[model samples]
Target chain A: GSSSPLPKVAHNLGFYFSPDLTQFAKLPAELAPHWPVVTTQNNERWPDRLVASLRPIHKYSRACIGAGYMVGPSVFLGTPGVVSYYLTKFVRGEAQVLPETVFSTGRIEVDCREYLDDRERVVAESLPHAFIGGCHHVTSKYLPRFLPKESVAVVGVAVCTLTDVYLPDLEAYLHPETQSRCWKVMLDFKEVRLMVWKDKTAYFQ
Target chain B: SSSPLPKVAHNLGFYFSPDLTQFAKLPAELAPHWPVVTTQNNERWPDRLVASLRPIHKYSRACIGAGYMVGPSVFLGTPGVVSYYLTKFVRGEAQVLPETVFSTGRIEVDCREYLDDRERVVAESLPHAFIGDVKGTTVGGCHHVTSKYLPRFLPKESVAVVGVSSPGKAAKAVCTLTDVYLPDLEAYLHPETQSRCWKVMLDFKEVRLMVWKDKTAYFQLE
Candidate 1:
């Protein structure tokens, strides 16, 4: 009355951790205020003063002409150079991105054979261009005060396969209802033959 | 034209470090005797005295046994009860076994399958009754060690596969050798058909001790 067990396939995914603000602040003057200031006793002040000082430069810098973003809590204004530089500098310790915030904490299941198909789609859809374009357009039209010059970006990536039982329960394992209040996306990358889950959360100094 | 490369079979072996003596001397009582006593002011001798007072136990107790034959170094001599107790009591940074002597190493090979066959014959030969007549009326008498001790009565069977290659040579990638060595053979039971290679070396300690203590009656009931 019984039969043989079914065969299964394996899947691999790649994850990346990138900070959004790093994509903005690109010039030294734009990041000067935010740059950690050491007191006589060698203590550093808050990063807000650095962001506030860069407000004027963001208005006139040639790098900001096409940038078209504001300086604020949510908006990052600057170029890639400034972003990569500061990210390598003062962003240490607690400034490091938490694993759960930057990784695809969710689980997805498809037919083992069809796992690649789903992974391909997820990767292509979760590109930086999609989020960057959306953020740029939305902030340029609405919330400009939140934008600032010389923001920092930190990104990380991890990929692995899943078992059959993890499929239907993807939401519970990855994006539970309680944590769904935050924005997150999972992508399947077919070009490199990988499934990529990305967390776009940014940390600034 | 040259002939094609011949196919080869493989085996695994374990090597012990040469520092086993240091581990054996770890007990304080075993410390070398000093001819005369001298006094020094502000000297703290409790630590050294405590170390000296510890009992000398079997080195096998502190060992970690596994299926794979790790590379060689000196084997330690610590009892199992003390080793297990120390491991349980210490959360972190506790020294249960001295690393200088009591470490394990491995060797593996990929050629000459016959090596395993030869090892089997040797391991089987370790037990008495398996090698020759037990009643003692045979024409050719085996060595007194085999006849009197019957060392094979309780044997510890160990098979090791070794891999070796010449330095900076392309052939090194495919070159491997296997060797099988039995620490004690008299203690083995049902001496055949058990060929899986993943037993902890410590498991054979008792069998080895039996053979070591009474080398003469190894194979006989005495």
Candidate 2:
């Protein structure tokens, strides 16, 4: 077989969005509910070192649902109650930074309720509507588009810090807010690279 | 037996921009995407125009969301597009009056829910009252806003449009359907200004009432 510089099975980041991290583990006394357990492409688990390469949009405006699907997108699934329930813990200050670039074969069979008709009703579960999406900042530009490159032995351990800067340039895209008495929620993943979760091909043409 | 190889479904993505004066004259490259623009005749310009748009349900009769168009195929939902419509609505640049519309379409309201779905997901999934009847006042009022800004191109990127009611909570939202591949990848995935992109009606609800291109249908659009 002919060989190219990079491996044949390449991956592209379909979408990336910032979710509130306060809802997961590394916070307090509990099990990580929002964390999706999965079986990956190569039986991979925690990715070693990762690097981030963000897109052209501002991370702030991308915040919130209906804020738009910048995080493209997936599932392995849970109820909105369960999602927001566990995610409810990912409060900014309360949330802790990821200890490692926990990567997984986000490819999994989800047990979910598919929206088939009106009435805001639920039906008997069937095949999954989504896959366990890998949560990281940016997929690096310098590395191979696939998992476990020759340069980096494995890609399952690192953090994805999407944004931070020294400029008036990106601020306009932020949400309108001031001080709040309640609490600030954030997904505290560090900045790393070449993270890939192959899931956006469904409806995004 | 069950069977289907339909590549991309008729993804209905609408965008609401602030002004249509610029949209009146479609660029040569962009001209053919809109057969509705032909409503203006050979003049190459419409009598009056505004760039913004919101999808409507002929049934509920509600103006759905702030609709904006950009990129190739008028990439209906972009930052600039969302920003313009949002800015206009916030500043009250345009007003949507109630309306009387007629049309035929079909749609599927998803009934399944994902265990992993978030509050925001379930929340923004549907327009405020898609199946409701818009009369004097139900829970709220839905005026008519039309997305007359049309385009003729291939699906270059995904698109989305979001709209709100008079007081400001979003009431309209839309997203495109599926993946696109060339060589039939399989069907017409090529982009042409005059390409004939067919449509299948999903659903309709009248949201905002505004100026219409149909002269017979006229009202004081404030």
Candidate 3:
């Protein structure tokens, strides 16, 4: 609906890790928005730092976050430029009259569950660790043909230690009432490896 | 025109739960926003199940804009008459729609709710009732529906003009402007044509272009 088609969800499956505020503090403002929220205080941990900046992108929106982070290892949410722009400028008094935010999310793991009838099956499983240059963001026009509506695969932008992924960490950042109502899915890279069954074996070698 | 209307215009209008209902699980605080008019006086129904509804969202607690992102639109009523406009609204998917059809000083167009499958079968089997006559015009009595709803649904004149700005925009020869074969550039549905585009004393400027097979795709703007 913008200048281009919008993708409803992001997909990724890779090792989960945490953002080090100290390491992130040095990033230029240009790249800062796409990455996790970082603060000058080097030792600041996850939810508190992330939630501290959780302001509504638009007060009335359900998922329309102005400048907050949904940093569950599996999935994260952000607004197209509008939300990020507001957050960047919000440090000062007011954000200029920005347009409505376009909400989106990405995950560290891509999982597909299908239901033939009542029972659901994990039809396909993937871990998006193959970070050639970071998320190869796809628009709706180029989404997985089988994907369903209103859902997306989360793709991570960077990687670090595996110890960083946890569901509780994500819940800690949300309002307590929202903390309990969530669906969680975990992907273990060690046990779950992606086999790109290519048409010809010679291509890999 | 599908057959001919029986020449009768009674009541036909109202809402149906397109499929199940969007209101089933919304936050209690924000439930009232999605309301549908009734067919009784014509309001309600869901006898035979049509699984796929026009895709739309029950109003949610998200941002107003996000709350408005629902869609998948459809229409119904008095056979071919414009009774109910179950449309996926602009901005977002709407759980409910507005409905009312006035005509010949009577219920020319009215809504019907879940009159049940039996009623639906009968309704589908029945012919539409249109007012007046089309005589020689290909545009026909369809204008009854057009004159009322077209402007309500047309994008703003500005947006309409932008869409027509493209070259080679072909259109059917039957135009509503003069109820005949493609009227002059000044008579097109778009606004701004008479004043902005046509330079004649209160005329609009128009553009020209091409068409595919059946004919030339040009609305020559002189």
Candidate 4:
């Protein structure tokens, strides 16, 4: 059970962005009581069951010390510092990934047609960019309306980059596998832009 | 006839004659080494933190005999015995610098070794390795922050005396030492009294000033 001052839903919206109904099942048992009553303003119901859980690849688990958040129908991951930066960009509607963006002749993008549900397919249209910064820079103030734990934000200072992937690709990327295997799955995509935002400001000498 | 000198005994039942004139003046050898400071701020008592600067040569670090560039000159831990632990430089002992002096606002020491059984037992009685003696003639500790010199030592004892030697004045109360109060910062959990202090009282023949609120393991004497 989440003892956070903010409602568990706020934490859910902030940290767990996966559209997979199976992802919802991993939440604490205490939230089960409110599961039935929870609904969007549009009255669209969310999934009641989670997908078959995938074990994180041991070596790749720490490749990036970060968390994934469900924003609208999309999930974003990065180090806490990077997440905070992206969160700011999300709320401000900042133009980060240009429309004509190209990475090595591939128009970097996430193809939801093969992986997303009907509702998620419709919602993905509004997502500006998939991810920014390294994963796991979780600051509660930046996590939607709910605050977050500090331990997750600190200690994991390892540098990592954000990559745009198909919904299923991201799902599989999170499953337990060595970094060797994880990169194999992520590299199978085309027209995807690998965007990066830095944690430090550049100063002129 | 005058009443017999009040009989005193150590905790271990050891009795010894006490010198009533130990704090009247200075010793002959240390005459060339006493640090000097001038007056300012409406001629009120000198505040070490805010007082006018003494000549650079007169500063503790530059003074001919002022122990280590940081920490105490002597540590008098027991009632019966005066265990003088001066700076490592004066003792010709090598120093191992402790960065806590700069990082956490602590008195830096070369090393934390106990000089003799006297300091070892006294330190064992205190929660921290640092201890102090109020009745001792002279003892002190100091630290430097960049070019701004600030004394970081303070003792836990409630009572302290800061005496000075003027031309015609017998032992007179100069002032009660107060810790530097920083109102804007968070209040320290320990009693403010734990802050280090310097007791500049008179000795036998020459000037002697003891600086340091606690006797730490880093303190040494030649």
- Candidate 2 on B129-161: residue-level lDDT in tens? 111122221111111121111111112222222
User: How close to the true structure is residue A46 of candidate 3, measured as C-alpha lDDT?
Assistant: 26
State every prediction's TM-score relative to the real structure.
Answer: 0.16, 0.19, 0.19, 0.17
Alpha-carbon runs more than 4 Å astray in model 1 = A1-172, A175-198, A201-205, B1-222
Better of 2 and 3 by lDDT: 3
Instruction: List, residue by residue over B167-217, the lDDT tens digit for candidate 3.
Output: 011111122211111122213233432222222210111223222222112
Locate the minimum summed-lDDT window of 10 residues in model 4 chain B. B1-10
The predicted structure with the larger DockQ, 3 or 4, is 3
TM-score of chain B of 1: 0.21
In candidate 1, what are the lDDT values of residues B1-222, reduced to their tens digit? 010000100100111111222112233332223111111111221211111112333321222222222123212212211211111111112223332111111222222122234434643454332222223211111222112211111111222111111111100001111121232333443234323122222322211212221211122211
- The candidates' DockQ values read 0.01, 0.01, 0.01, 0.00
Stretches of model 3 off by over 4 angstroms after superposition: A1-152, A155-205, B1-36, B42-73, B76-80, B84-222
> Runs in model 2 with CA error above 4 Å?
A1-73, A76-205, B1-26, B29-42, B45-222
DockQ of 1: 0.01
Expressed as tens digits, the lDDT of each residue in A1-45 for candidate 1 is 000001110011111111222223233433434444211111133
Error of 1 at B168 (Å): 46
Model 4 fnat value: 0.00
Model 4: number of backbone collisions: 49
